[PDB]
Design a protein around this ligand. Structure first.
Ligand SMILES: NC(=O)c1ccc[n+]([C@@H]2O[C@H](COP(=O)([O-])OP(=O)(O)OC[C@H]3O[C@@H](n4cnc5c(N)ncnc54)[C@H](O)[C@@H]3O)[C@@H](O)[C@H]2O)c1
Ligand SMILES: NC(=O)c1ccc[n+]([C@@H]2O[C@H](COP(=O)([O-])OP(=O)(O)OC[C@H]3O[C@@H](n4cnc5c(N)ncnc54)[C@H](O)[C@@H]3O)[C@@H](O)[C@H]2O)c1
Ligand SMILES: NC(=O)c1ccc[n+]([C@@H]2O[C@H](COP(=O)([O-])OP(=O)(O)OC[C@H]3O[C@@H](n4cnc5c(N)ncnc54)[C@H](O)[C@@H]3O)[C@@H](O)[C@H]2O)c1
Ligand SMILES: NC(=O)c1ccc[n+]([C@@H]2O[C@H](COP(=O)([O-])OP(=O)(O)OC[C@H]3O[C@@H](n4cnc5c(N)ncnc54)[C@H](O)[C@@H]3O)[C@@H](O)[C@H]2O)c1
Ligand SMILES: O=C([O-])CC(=O)C(=O)O
Ligand SMILES: O=C([O-])CC(=O)C(=O)O
Ligand SMILES: O=C([O-])CC(=O)C(=O)O
Ligand SMILES: O=C([O-])CC(=O)C(=O)O
Lengths: 307, 311, 311, 302
């Protein structure tokens, strides 16, 4: 008997929905879209509106909304986007319990699933999910590398006036100040960008990448990015579901890699049927090594804010 | 030096934004997303967040957010989802009228910078609002269309897919007239891989599917609480956009301007149509049963009702 | 471990190659192109060529070429196209026996290495060649499938599409019976956007179209001069493969072991089918006219008259 | 009135036919299949077989087979695959081909595949009367794609994440830069030692012959048709890709008066510009050994 893949997308907000919707139209499998019971009606409203567009886009996928994790039973992938002028401490603590509470139900109804976390801060929350899940390091990944690279590509595209298919960004660690960009491993059709873009403009593109998610927040006035984040999540689900062995930047457990371990950190990754198949150790220059250390201690910080 | 197509989506709300997103990702061309001046930053927020997903999904489109119609310069297709939704305290006539003025302000600007474009109208009441854009655009009837029956058949097909547990791709569906009580389904022209549905589903459930397809927009309003359908409505718009942009000569129900078709004239109404590169190519004039001919009459008195509400 | 679906395409000729290329392209799995040892070199040269396309079209599928059934191990779907064509000074009986022979020798080696595969058969005469495969496979009826209906309705839809000047998306067809002459197309079950084709095409034009579809294959071999159609055939195979692999529960006309449906038993025939993750989920029994029951018995007559040449 | 993009595939054999299907499949537009009027019927039934697959795959595309060039009227793109499974034999086809092609589609971009392609595209360029951006060759997209394959098998990572770059002719004329190839963006020199990297460069070079040598009585059509289509799509969708492509140099790299595989921007106006990679002392010397052969083939012409 052939069964289509089953993907459960927890949190039915702006990214979780846009994600659920891409997942459906591509026919990567049936999508179960979960939120708290107070938002179950909306979440079934957002499932069904999506599913009523299944005749029109000509895609065969089931899309249901629910407040009940029994609907998540036997998922291949689980993507967690669930999350809430307030302190860093109370954001990390608040989202952390939500990570613990989402996880216990997820792994319970989905024992052999791969989990992809988006939740902010995705460095410490994927940690929380890794921990809480019990799962071996390969089955728990965070998104942040692919969205940063994607921002930098777009900027590098609209600067050279070429295709986004031809620009490859290389981002290490998390977002903004925690970002360790590798421009030397960034190209336009394999041409090092550092020979196409002048430093001042390239330094600008780096900082805008850093300031990329804040920038959308200020544009919207109410909320953060969901389109590009959503597209980031799907592409990593596409990698696992189709064992594509993608080299993409992911948030990943480190067990000695770059001389660090017992943390999550955004690193070069091979993405396939066993989720994270290989963390990749680059040989890094002295500035990169030292800037990575800032970013590692900047993640050990939020992890001191975990309870 | 023959370049990308240009689609401008007026209103950067849930429908305009979702629709713009689908358009770009199918590389149907460059998308200019347009809303009011207060909401320029949020629009640009939506178009920037879209474009930034393009290196991920591997589609090459320009997408911009803007309240300056300069940016819609020489658009091939224009989708109007620019609209008020019901304001608690509003009469039918106030919405109807509030929305018409928006059509006039939006249309004027659309033919100013894109006088040789094709216009697809979602704004409620769509029957009355596509008419507004036709008589203010000064366009030929073929260059201005309303979306309505795609979303109603897409709804109908899902419930029928769900009843018979078969691919939505092999379920079809026919409706003339509008949404709600205006909707004029032909079960006799609805099927499952070419088996008329009446042979497959009992009468209680089949009537039940029709009823669910009148109330279909309401179903989605009641579940969300605030807001309305966007994904199904956006896909629908995208089907009609795709038809015209690729000259597909599809047979879709669209809101088109009758000039004697079914012996009605000077109006827009949901009729079967060829949709292709000349917009609405033909209105298909079916031979209906007296029943159908007369339920369509009720449906057309409805469209007249609203039409008497235009200032 | 999440693993990709594995498909094996027996016979690396025009149809089997093409099928292997389309499958690869859709990322529907890993593809194993399988001919006789004498054509192993050219079969590996196709698989590599196909695989060398994948950086360009942008799919990750693994394609290799073998004579050896060992690289078909634990295959989910096997698509049997392997066969010989008509050789001059050879009768009906000797192509049938020779192909049957091949059907039997391919299948003992397919069901050894892939015991829980679904098998889609193309080899002409398909209805008997499907029947052989089902006897030698010892698999239940739902796992052994033939292609013929989708090819022919595609041919029919293409002729109506030409005839009306509309997209083929909105043309629906339905054909029971084998191929060529022994082919039963229901014009009453054929529509252009849900509208019966009898209301749109006059009877001379609609009968001739029905006649072009009967001769549909021969038309192409007469134009080619040397060999039979491969694009339309391989596409047909892919939709059927895709329906099993994404459990899409399509209503498709497939070749299916009849066990009382349409008043027939103990044969494989073109019939209505729901094609899903469990192969042939169910044959759908239509209400036919006596003209159609006699028209289908004519097909079964030529079909059974072919089955007789077996052993 | 909105109207389809039209693509005439000149050559209705293995590469010509395989290209037109894909093109129709992707809905890049309407497709005229062409060959000699002898082979008018085999063409037409390639055209019909393909158009008969459209209901099943579900793409709206007119695919027609013809030997009358009138039916290739108004083509946006013209794909030249008319050759013989001899630079003088394939030269003399280009000349008769190009004259009718500029005559029905005078506005059209010409992407050529016929071997020896840099010399056959050059021959197309000279008869065409068109600008240097309007006549393109296909080489590096195929060789590079053979490279990314071999580099994909070797590391077992996605093909999508392998990058490649080959400058120069088709065969032992190829000068791919292993230092402008990567896997995940991380240079291959760092991922693969010199004896196995040398082997991938070697296998890339023989690439075409490996395909001939297995097949027995033809050459490559699946990777070649995809390579053409990618280049069609760049022009038809103004994609503005940086693809390896055969391009008429007028100074570039201190070479001119010759077609040769070089980095380019490929998009709406065809080849918009060729890109000048500054090269290691042995890449320049090696590019020259490739050209100096290439030039000879053009002293095989007329
Ligand atoms: N890495 C990134 O891409 C990135 C960028 C944007 C968003 N984010 C983070 O991703 C998350 C998603 O944000 P969004 O834009 O989708 O916002 P949103 O508020 O619209 O979505 C959040 C949803 O999660 C639900 N939720 C909250 N607690 C839950 C619980 N215990 N169980 C189940 N559902 C619960 C809420 O009810 C809400 O529907 C946030 O934490 C945000 O900070 C980070
Ligand atoms: N007829 C149908 O088939 C159908 C289906 C669903 C939606 N609709 C209609 O579509 C309309 C809006 O749909 P939505 O769900 O996206 O709503 P929405 O309110 O979220 O989005 C509408 C957007 O239009 C903008 N707008 C208002 N007046 C404008 C003007 N003069 N110029 C430019 N932009 C302007 C608003 O700022 C808002 O952002 C409503 O009238 C709704 O009834 C009808
Ligand atoms: N059902 C349909 O609609 C339909 C349409 C087209 C073709 N067909 C039939 O399908 C078959 C395929 O024809 P084609 O166009 O590919 O012709 P072809 O001869 O080019 O392809 C068939 C291939 O089968 C191979 N083969 C033979 N014996 C084999 C064996 N024991 N194991 C493995 N491979 C073996 C041959 O070596 C040959 O390469 C024919 O029997 C044809 O009549 C039916
Ligand atoms: N240079 C490259 O990048 C590359 C890659 C693969 C193939 N090729 C070349 O592609 C070309 C075609 O290859 P193929 O494998 O399709 O061969 P093929 O089997 O298609 O033979 C060439 C086709 O062109 C037709 N043709 C010949 N003269 C013609 C004329 N005067 N007008 C119109 N059509 C004519 C032939 O009848 C035949 O259909 C050959 O030159 C081959 O060497 C080179
Ligand atoms: O925290 C934010 O500002 C949002 C963010 O990082 C992101 O979008 O990736
Ligand atoms: O009016 C509304 O609320 C929206 C609507 O018609 C629909 O979705 O069909
Ligand atoms: O019938 C034939 O001769 C070949 C065939 O199956 C087809 O193409 O339909
Ligand atoms: O020489 C040939 O026949 C074609 C060729 O270069 C190739 O396939 O790479």
């Amino acid at each position: 008997a052939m069964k289509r893949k089953k993907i459960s997308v927890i949190g039915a907000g702006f990214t979780g929905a846009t994600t659920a919707f891409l997942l459906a139209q591509k026919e990567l499998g049936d999508v179960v879209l979960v939120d708290i019971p107070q938002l179950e009606n909306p979440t079934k409203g957002k499932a069904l509106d999506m599913l009523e567009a299944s005749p029109v886009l000509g895609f065969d996928a089931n899309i249901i909304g629910t407040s009940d994790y029994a609907d998540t039973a036997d998922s291949d992938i689980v993507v967690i986007t669930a999350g809430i002028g307030m302190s860093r401490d109370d954001l990390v603590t608040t989202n952390q319990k939500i990570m613990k509470q989402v996880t216990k139900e997820v792994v319970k109804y989905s024992p052999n699933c791969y989990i992809i976390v988006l939740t902010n801060p995705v460095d410490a929350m994927t940690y929380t999910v890794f921990k809480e899940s019990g799962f071996p390091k390969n089955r728990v990944i965070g998104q942040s590398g692919v969205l940063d690279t994607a921002r930098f590509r777009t900027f590098v595209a609209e600067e050279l006036n070429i295709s986004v298919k031809d620009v490859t960004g290389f981002v290490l660690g998390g977002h903004g100040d925690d970002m360790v960009p590798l421009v030397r491993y960034s190209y336009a059709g394999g041409i090092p960008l550092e020979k196409l873009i002048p430093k001042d403009r390239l330094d600008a593109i780096v900082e805008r990448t850093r300031k990329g998610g804040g920038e959308i927040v200020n544009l919207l006035g109410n909320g953060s990015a969901y389109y590009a984040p959503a597209a980031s999540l799907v592409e990593m689900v596409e990698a696992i579901l189709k064992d594509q062995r993608r080299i993409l930047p992911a948030i990943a457990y480190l067990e000695g890699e770059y001389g660090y371990e017992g943390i999550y950190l955004g690193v070069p990754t091979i993405l396939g049927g066993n989720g994270i198949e290989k963390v990749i150790e680059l040989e890094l220059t002295e500035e990169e090594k030292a800037a990575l250390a800032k970013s590692v201690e900047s993640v050990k910080n939020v992890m001191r804010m975990l309870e």
